[PDB]
Write a protein that binds this ligand. Structure first.
Ligand SMILES: CC(=O)O[C@H]1C(=O)[C@@]2(C)[C@H]([C@H](OC(=O)c3ccccc3)[C@]3(O)C[C@H](OC(=O)[C@H](O)[C@@H](NC(=O)c4ccccc4)c4ccccc4)C(C)=C1C3(C)C)[C@]1(OC(C)=O)CO[C@@H]1C[C@@H]2O
Ligand SMILES: Nc1nc2c(ncn2[C@@H]2O[C@H](COP(=O)(O)OP(=O)(O)OP(=O)(O)O)[C@@H](O)[C@H]2O)c(=O)[nH]1
Ligand SMILES: Nc1ncnc2c1ncn2[C@@H]1O[C@H](COP(=O)(O)OP(=O)(O)NP(=O)(O)O)[C@@H](O)[C@H]1O
Ligand SMILES: Nc1nc2c(ncn2[C@@H]2O[C@H](COP(=O)(O)OP(=O)(O)O)[C@@H](O)[C@H]2O)c(=O)[nH]1
Ligand SMILES: [Mg+2]
Ligand SMILES: [Mg+2]
Lengths: 429, 441, 366
């Protein structure tokens, strides 16, 4: 069976991982102890996808944690589901990078990446058929980015035939967290694009508006935003673990989504959300889901498609549905809103359907998009970058770790190039 | 873990450290005798953390701090005070005499035979660290010991350890209020050195906190026993990220790399939400949206510095209590929304954020009332150069006639050393102009 | 100088392999014009090139040796090099089409590369004067599985001595290799020794299509600087020019159906085909650019293209040589090659000479 190694790196990722497994465990009938108490073999037929088994009919996840520079270590362990994780997979060091990428790539992570890599090799070897890797992190920060791309590259050299996926919280346009995100990320993107099969670009701001308006929540937290990220992470791989009329898998997602090897950044979405009240005020249909799916406000990436166009998408549905209504609905979208789509791709969309709905929903769906709108985020990071670079605004902190101007320069040329590539196809022809 | 050392040099810091450790112990349920009847009752919790406090086998806890001021009549208060059975008795009262507003005694003459032990007991403290380190040195500028000594210490420390963050919470000299005539001499001579060794010298004034204490706290007749607490809370608001959990916690190094564009401009400010009295403890919501406006109000600045005469380079905010991140994002946006607040072109990012859950505590005998949330702000701006201007000018007049100098020479400091700092501080001011000016193409 | 690329072609004849398994002729040279007969005898494709040679036979006019081909194709680039222009020549085509046999050739009939090299050394001998001082250097490296390795290094002693390098992009002069051990040339003899070492250590191997295949991509760089007098009464020898020559031996498709193989073999073949595809896309967008089209060029989609950016385009007087077979067994391959070439003529770059009057005032006076 297909097997995945999930990795956690950075304050933002580990919590996403933390919220993640809490969902998967619920999708597989597992308790905080790791025992089975479900009611369906389906929750077990493919448990080896994400988990290993242990002696007394317990089930250990294939999770790894690498930036547990300890401050978040206890936070994970002393949690409602901290205890299931393999204690040996709790890898860490100390003296956090202070968001300095170089410390997170060249000095400290250098010392630690061996050990985490060694553990990965174990989880790899214990597999029967390894498919790909699943990393959670964020750009803009030191650990999630630098140590990430480091660990990503090495793994790629060891398993270049295999798949490497990420779900990376991206820096915002407006509301920053750190002040050197243009520095921290562009370096990351330089190594991210070149050592990746795909990545899922997520922005906090969109998630806020998403939870603010559609979910109509006035007091959302980092704990709840993630709860949406974990959903998509699970929907992408629903057709992996569960059956359906039309099956999908990670490899089948890329090849239909990645026309050119460098345009492998995506804008996900997920349905359906209704703030509990309106639940009594609708009904779940395929056109209904589709309607939210291509909603310009359900895009967690914050790159308004309507100033750009789509290359290719993947609309993974989940539940009991009829395929006629499915295939019809995509065509309608291709028809009416054709200008947002490419001519030289004759069909700009694929599909996938799994016959197993989630815990308390009759039908669900997951969105995946590849579009030209991603240019905008990329310009921002570039424009922010240069304004600081030319004055060497904060540069001296990295040079103290051994970086040089060329490296910052290199990534810039690369990032601008990615933009131009998208801009090539941005104009209708 | 993470460790952090508290050093108090002179009187001004020591008097503060009394305020600090009082809050720390209280905030962590620790008793003055180092005991934990709260842990006895609970039977759990790592509260008595290695961030600030060591622990023995007896359940007693001991703070990671030393101090020295070359004035026994102060430290002895602690050796007799209620916290005497807290601290390690290897606190360095070598005060045969005081520096007496003379830099040179603390640096050259009687800085000898004292600093040898300061470093020693420090080494002993570091040897107990199985984790991060970072230094909190509390002094006052313009003073005879709070400078001439603290110049040595940071220099030696940049050698023994070097690759550690060296932070300072320090009293700047006011424009008007002075308790001496030699603050300008004593101050400028200091900056010649700590500019090179340190990495972030958080500054405060007494004039500002005085006026603050009148307006918002409704306090007519303050003293050090009310000022220090505010200065203590700020230090906590920083360091609380280390001891407690939070959605967006921060270390000490994180500040260093975000606030400090160029090595030599590491001179930021601070504010808070001490807008609180038992009476006005009501009638307000104390939202995230209110305080953030306040944290850029000229009045609630803790030094006598008009931001509006300069621009912001970079800023960091640290919230406590029941705080919602989304609300922060709206609020920060509002702060950019306002046009009075001019940032450098350099930093559309501009801001950092950190958040903790653990709200502030209150000290009985105190004034600042209870709340559900609070924030600390830090800021690096250009406006301070004007304050640096004041000191260079004050210096200029009473140096020209070489007033008071025979004293400093009387301890062996050469004439030209004064000018050396001056050329430096002028150049430093010039740096603020270069950077403050907008970029071009 | 917005100017085009010289595209040349060489139909090699058939072999023992065809003798054993009969494979008819279908490529035909009307002196120089290329014509290919479909084995179905339903179509004749034909292609026109700036240059042709008919090595299918020694007798009919159009025939040319290595050095005839040189003085047709590469000596002009020698000329532009001494004029100061960066220059390029690169090969293309399938396995067993003599792509090395042309560029590098063997001991007994060495290729355009060694012919040009001795011509270059003696051409410096023609002007070995104090009028202009000359300084020549060269590097030589290989591409295998997107990994860059140094041909001029004596490997150490270990089970794995294929030390990888990496690429870096100077903001001005463009890409280059770290640790690339560019060495000084005294003469063509030194060039020869260097080339011998490199071609020996090249990761090449026997297979079912040829006894020895170029399974890695090879780059051979020379750079000649020439410091000349300026037109001033003061320091006269303050003018200099540089010229960068780039000679490239690529790999062939090696379709696995005939190149039945496994493991590392198929891996190298995959990487090769991927590289060549990327190159083809580069070439095509370049042609479209030469047609005036505003187009994004995926130089960065691999290493070969990235390094050869300034040669595939940029600023250099350049050429390509395409190798093709007569056997109908590989007519599809030869057609693809010919179409690659006939498209390739359409490409232009903007070629000047590298004085590098940096900190000189000479270009400013000019
Ligand atoms: C339980 C119930 O009958 O009420 C619904 C409910 O009110 C609604 C609004 C739920 C609810 O969603 C939220 O309340 C929510 C709040 C903050 C952030 C994110 C979600 C629900 O929590 C979400 C929950 O969905 C699930 O149970 C799935 O397991 C979902 N994840 C979880 O909710 C979950 C989290 C922790 C532990 C166990 C389950 C999921 C998502 C992706 C992949 C698999 C499963 C459901 C049906 C509901 C509640 C519980 C109210 C909705 O979400 C889902 C997945 O159903 C929000 O819009 C849908 C429509 C549902 O009707
Ligand atoms: N904010 C604050 N400032 C203080 C306190 N105690 C003293 N100071 C300041 O310290 C300065 C006096 O010089 P100090 O540096 O304290 O003198 P010292 O540190 O005892 O060393 P000497 O200069 O030798 O006395 C004045 O500017 C006071 O405002 C205090 O409790 N709070
Ligand atoms: N036109 C020709 N006339 C005479 N001999 C030739 C001709 N072309 C090739 N040969 C010889 O036949 C052999 C086949 O060429 P070969 O060198 O295998 O092609 P290649 O350049 O190696 N292709 P690759 O290995 O994919 O780079 C060579 O060793 C040449 O000596
Ligand atoms: N969605 C989400 N994002 C978070 C969370 N915590 C932090 N982040 C984001 O992650 C970024 C912090 O980067 P981080 O990975 O902590 O830096 P590093 O760990 O030092 O590399 C900030 O931009 C935060 O907005 C969380 O719980 N959920
Ligand atoms: Mg004193
Ligand atoms: Mg060859």
């Amino acid at each position: 069976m297909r097997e995945i190694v999930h990795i956690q790196a950075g304050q933002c990722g580990n919590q996403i991982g933390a919220k993640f497994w809490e969902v998967i465990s619920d999708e597989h009938g597992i308790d905080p102890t790791g025992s089975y108490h479900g009611d369906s073999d389906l929750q077990l037929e493919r448990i080896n996808v994400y988990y290993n088994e242990a002696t007394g009919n317990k089930y250990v996840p294939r999770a790894i944690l690498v930036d547990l520079e300890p401050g978040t270590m206890d936070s994970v362990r002393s949690g409602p589901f901290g205890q299931i994780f393999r204690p040996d997979n709790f890898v860490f060091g100390q003296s956090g990078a202070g968001n300095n990428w170089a410390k997170g790539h060249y000095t400290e992570g250098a010392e630690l990446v061996d050990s985490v890599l060694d553990v990965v090799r174990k989880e790899s070897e214990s597999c029967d058929c390894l498919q790909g890797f699943q990393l959670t992190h964020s750009l803009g920060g030191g650990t999630g980015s630098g140590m990430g791309t480091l660990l990503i590259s090495k793994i790629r050299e060891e398993y270049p035939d295999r798949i490497m996926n990420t779900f990376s919280v991206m820096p915002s346009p407006k509301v920053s967290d750190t002040v050197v995100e243009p520095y921290n990320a562009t370096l990351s993107v330089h190594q991210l694009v070149e050592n990746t099969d795909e990545t899922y670009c997520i922005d906090n701001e969109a998630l806020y508006d998403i939870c603010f308006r559609t979910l109509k929540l006035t007091t959302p937290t980092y704990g709840d935003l993630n709860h949406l990220v974990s959903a998509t992470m699970s929907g992408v791989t629903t057709c992996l673990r569960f059956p359906g009329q039309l099956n999908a898998d990670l490899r089948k997602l890329a090849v239909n989504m990645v026309p050119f090897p460098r345009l492998h950044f995506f804008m996900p979405g997920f349905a359906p959300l209704t703030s509990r009240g309106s639940q009594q005020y609708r009904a779940l249909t395929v056109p209904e889901l589709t309607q939210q799916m291509f909603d310009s406000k359900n895009m967690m990436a914050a790159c308004d498609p309507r100033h750009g166009r789509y290359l290719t998408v993947a609309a993974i549905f989940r539940g009991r549905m009829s395929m006629k209504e499915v295939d019809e609905q995509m065509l309608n979208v291709q028809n009416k809103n054709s200008s947002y789509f490419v001519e030289w791709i004759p069909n700009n969309v694929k599909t996938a359907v799994c016959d197993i709905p989630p815990r308390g929903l009759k039908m669900s769906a997951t969105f995946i998009g590849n579009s030209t709108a991603i240019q905008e985020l990329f310009k921002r990071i570039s424009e922010q970058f240069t304004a600081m670079f030319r004055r060497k605004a904060f540069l001296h902190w990295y040079t103290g770790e051994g970086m040089d101007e060329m490296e910052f320069t290199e990534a810039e040329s690369n990032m601008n190039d990615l933009v131009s590539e998208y801009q090539q196809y941005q104009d209708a022809t | 873990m993470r460790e952090c050392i508290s050093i108090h040099v002179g009187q001004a810091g020591v008097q503060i450290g009394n305020a600090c450790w009082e809050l720390y112990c209280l905030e962590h349920g620790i008793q003055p005798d180092g005991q934990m009847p709260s842990d006895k009752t609970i039977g759990g919790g790592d509260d008595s953390f290695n961030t600030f406090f060591s622990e023995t086998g007896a359940g007693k806890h001991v703070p990671r701090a030393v101090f020295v001021d070359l004035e026994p009549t102060v430290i002895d208060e602690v050796r007799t005070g209620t916290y005497r059975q807290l601290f390690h008795p290897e606190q360095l009262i070598t005060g045969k005499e005081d520096a007496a507003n003379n830099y040179a005694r603390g640096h050259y003459t009687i800085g000898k035979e004292i600093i040898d032990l300061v470093l020693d007991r420090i080494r002993k403290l570091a040897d107990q660290c199985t984790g991060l380190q970072g230094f909190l040195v509390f002094h006052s500028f313009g003073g005879g010991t709070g400078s001439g000594f603290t110049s040595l210490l940071m220099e030696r420390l940049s050698v023994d350890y070097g690759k550690k963050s060296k932070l300072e919470f320090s009293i700047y000299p006011a424009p008007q209020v002075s308790t001496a005539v030699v603050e300008p001499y004593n101050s400028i001579l200091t900056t010649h050195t700590t500019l090179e060794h340190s990495d972030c010298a958080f500054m405060v004034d007494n004039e500002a906190i005085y006026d603050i204490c009148r307006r918002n706290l409704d306090i007519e007749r303050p003293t050090y026993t009310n000022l220090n607490r505010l200065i203590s809370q700020i230090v906590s608001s920083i360091t609380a990220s280390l001891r407690f959990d939070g959605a967006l916690n921060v270390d000490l190094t994180e500040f260093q790399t975000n606030l400090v564009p160029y090595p030599r401009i590491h001179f930021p400010l601070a504010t808070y939400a001490p807008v609180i009295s038992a009476e006005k403890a009501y009638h307000e919501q104390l939202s995230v949206a209110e305080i953030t406006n306040a944290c850029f109000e000229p009045a609630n600045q803790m030094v006598k510095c008009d931001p509006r005469h300069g621009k912001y380079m970079a800023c960091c905010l640290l919230y406590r209590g029941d705080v919602v991140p989304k609300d922060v994002n709206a609020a920060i946006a509002t702060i950019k929304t306002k046009r009075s607040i001019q940032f450098v072109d350099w930093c559309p990012t501009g801001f950092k954020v950190g958040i903790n859950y653990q709200p502030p505590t209150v000290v009985p005998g105190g004034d600042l009332a209870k709340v559900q949330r609070a924030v600390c702000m830090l800021s690096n701006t250009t406006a301070i150069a004007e304050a640096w201007a004041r000191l260079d000018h004050k210096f200029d007049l009473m140096y020209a006639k070489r007033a008071f100098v025979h004293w400093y020479v009387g301890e062996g400091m050469e004439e030209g050393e004064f000018s050396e700092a001056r050329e430096d501080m002028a150049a430093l001011e010039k740096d603020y102009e270069e950077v403050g000016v907008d970029s071009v193409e | 100088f917005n100017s085009q690329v010289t595209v040349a072609v060489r139909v090699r004849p058939f072999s023992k392999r065809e003798k054993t398994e009969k494979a008819s002729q279908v490529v035909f040279t009307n002196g120089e014009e290329i014509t290919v007969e479909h084995p179905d005898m339903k179509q004749v494709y034909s292609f026109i090139y700036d240059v042709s040679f008919w090595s299918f036979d020694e007798c009919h006019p159009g025939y040319a040796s290595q050095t005839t081909v040189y003085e047709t194709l590469a000596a002009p680039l020698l000329d532009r090099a001494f004029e100061g222009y960066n220059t390029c020549l690169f090969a293309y085509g399938q396995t067993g089409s003599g792509k090395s046999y042309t560029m590098m050739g063997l001991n007994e009939e060495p290729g355009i590369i060694p012919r040009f090299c001795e011509d270059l050394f003696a051409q410096i001998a023609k002007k070995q004067t104090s009028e202009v001082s000359y300084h020549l250097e060269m590097s030589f490296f290989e591409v295998y599985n997107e990994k860059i390795h140094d041909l001029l290094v004596c490997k150490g002693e270990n089970g794995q001595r294929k030390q990888p390098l990496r690429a870096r992009e100077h903001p001005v002069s463009g890409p280059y290799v770290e640790g690339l051990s560019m060495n000084v040339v005294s003469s063509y003899s030194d060039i020869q020794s260097w080339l011998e070492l490199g071609n020996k250590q090249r990761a090449t191997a026997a297979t079912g299509m040829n006894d020895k295949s170029s399974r890695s991509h090879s780059v051979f760089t020379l750079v000649m600087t020439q410091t000349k007098t300026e037109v001033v009464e003061g320091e006269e020898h303050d003018h200099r020019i540089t010229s960068r020559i780039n000679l490239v031996d690529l790999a062939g498709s090696e379709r696995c159906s005939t190149a039945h193989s496994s493991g590392q073999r198929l891996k190298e073949g995959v990487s090769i085909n991927k590289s060549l595809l990327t190159l083809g896309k580069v070439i095509s967008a370049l042609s479209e650019q030469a047609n005036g089209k505003r187009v994004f060029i995926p130089y960065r989609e691999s290493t070969l293209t990235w390094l050869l950016k300034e040669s595939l385009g940029g600023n250099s007087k350049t050429a390509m040589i395409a190798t093709v077979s007569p056997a109908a067994s590989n007519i599809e391959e030869t057609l693809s090659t010919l179409r690659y070439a006939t498209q390739a003529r359409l490409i232009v770059n903007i070629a000047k000479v590298n004085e590098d009057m940096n900190a000189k005032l000479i270009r400013e006076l000019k």
